[model samples]
Target chain A: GLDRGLELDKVLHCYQMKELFLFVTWKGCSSIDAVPMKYIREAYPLQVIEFFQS
Target chain B: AKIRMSQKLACWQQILTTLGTSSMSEQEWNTFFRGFLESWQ
Candidate 1:
């Protein structure tokens, strides 16, 4: 859902949330990737990270 | 000034809690935010 405009505040907010999300996953904890896109949208409407495309 | 600084700590704690990933110990949390601040700013 990487469809939102890249407003600075929006990008910073989403980036921070994503950092927290990925850090926990890296820490051998749970993956919230299945926590529903609803929460993601409620926070930020774009999943901007380009997953590896190879 | 002390209260203001504490609010910055509270802000990140709230961020972690809201993200549902508030399981790190205080030491780990401190390390993470320090690294994050330095990396970004």
Candidate 2:
């Protein structure tokens, strides 16, 4: 839960899993919203840094 | 899909901004996070 201090490392790890899984999914077909990779590549980290600050 | 993904990014950014800026309880953030992922699907 978001209850604990943002376990930055855990969140980072989960995203890594998602990133790899999505890459595989993307290669299988273009149907998944698995590309655009922008959110995972950029958005979350920017926000996570905010979490770190807070 | 790009449009949807863009919106998803916006939503994600908004959620993080809200969660990070405000003083929400842990459970609240947990619930929001779960719901956020569900919406992404």
Candidate 3:
């Protein structure tokens, strides 16, 4: 696994449609070197973050 | 994309960090996942 894998766009695309149920089922990422964490942090509302950590 | 379901839950988490979140960002993941999970529940 190297160079590429999944990315935020695909992730957000799923979230935007409220289809993360399916998103969670996604798999086979070579590497996350392409994805950006902070970008997604902003994309989501702060309130939504609580579900993961409280 | 043909997201062939992996045999393990670990693959799902990797997609998270791979998608954008940091190594822990998919905890990080619980939000993206929980958000949708909540919708179903």
Candidate 4:
């Protein structure tokens, strides 16, 4: 099962802070898109998404 | 006045580039911003 119709090839955890997780895909054919909080919620309803300020 | 004017111009350029309209993904944006911050540091 993949999110946003993305083909699951490999997942890389680029960065993480407490509850926030930043992931990158190694698949080159996939769309260059970001899964925002709303989209993430649509994919995984139980997970919490946090907004980071920098 | 010359030094202050130069600093102001630099700041303006930085601000514009930082917030420029670019249709980049979250990962791309994060990578770019992190690289910029790292270079500044």
Candidate 5:
């Protein structure tokens, strides 16, 4: 829950619902490494600036 | 355990203490937030 709490606002603000959601799903499915890709994608999205400011 | 555990421990402590006490202090809440932030990587 602490992890969820720390990341929820960042994930939501970045409009990373899909990537975060997918990563969470993968994590739940016993795939920990898959989660980092979500963060990587989030860090370099084509519309990252717009998504963050929006 | 000092940080993340503190938040969980403090919240549980406050909950148990409040069951018989009149109120909780603002300091406890501040401590909770502080520990919560510290848990972040």
Candidate 6:
């Protein structure tokens, strides 16, 4: 029921438009990693992220 | 130039920290996104 994933999609798209990757540090993970669209998309499970039907 | 790139990076960092993390209504987000897209045009 969280829209965070959808909201994050916009943020990722913004980065993609500039041809830049995102740097992410997970809450538990100590390493910061650069992520591209392909990896980012894979990380977000659409099955759990609610998509509003129009 | 590196300075110009930094400027872009600064603005993007601000956008990420603010808009990316903040919660707003769908209409508000739509309005913001429209303006954001126009900046690139």
Best by lDDT: 6
Query: Mind giving the per-residue lDDT tens digits that candidate 4 earns over B1-41?
Result: 11233433343343334345365566866675565344323
Q: Given candidate 5, what's the lDDT at residue A50? A: 44
TM-score against truth, every candidate: 0.36, 0.28, 0.23, 0.26, 0.21, 0.26
Report the C-alpha lDDT of model 1 over A1-54, residue by residue, as the tens digit: 122222212122112434432211112322212222344445444432422111
State the lDDT of candidate 4 residue by residue for A1-54, as single tens digits: 224465433322222221222232324543222233444445545433332322
TM-score of chain A of each: 0.24, 0.21, 0.24, 0.29, 0.20, 0.35
Q: Clash pairs of candidate 6?
A: none
Writing each residue's lDDT as its tens digit, candidate 6 over A1-54 gives 111233243222233333344433344443333344355556654521332121
- After superposition, candidate 3 runs with Cα above 4 Å error: A1-54, B1-8, B23-28, B36-41
* TM-score, structure 3 vs. true: 0.23
- What TM-score quantifies how close candidate 2 is to the native fold? 0.28
TM-score of chain A of 1: 0.24
Write the residue-wise lDDT of candidate 6 on B1-41 in tens digits: 11234444445455555446456666776676565445444
Quality of candidate 4 docking, DockQ:
0.05
**Candidate 2 local lDDT, B1-41, one digit each (tens):** 22355545544554454336355677876675575566435
Off by over 4 Å in 4: A1-4, A7-33, A47-54, B1-32, B35-41
Q: How well is candidate 3 docked (DockQ)?
A: 0.11
Candidate 4 backbone collisions, by pair: none
Clashing pairs in 5: none
Better of 4 and 5 by DockQ: 4
Q: What is the lDDT of residue B2 in candidate 3?
A: 38
Each model's lDDT:
0.38, 0.37, 0.37, 0.37, 0.34, 0.41
> Chain A of candidate 2 scores what in TM-score?
0.21
lDDT-wise, the better of 3 and 5 is: 3
In model 1, pairs of residues that clash are none
Error of 3 at B14 (Å): 3.2
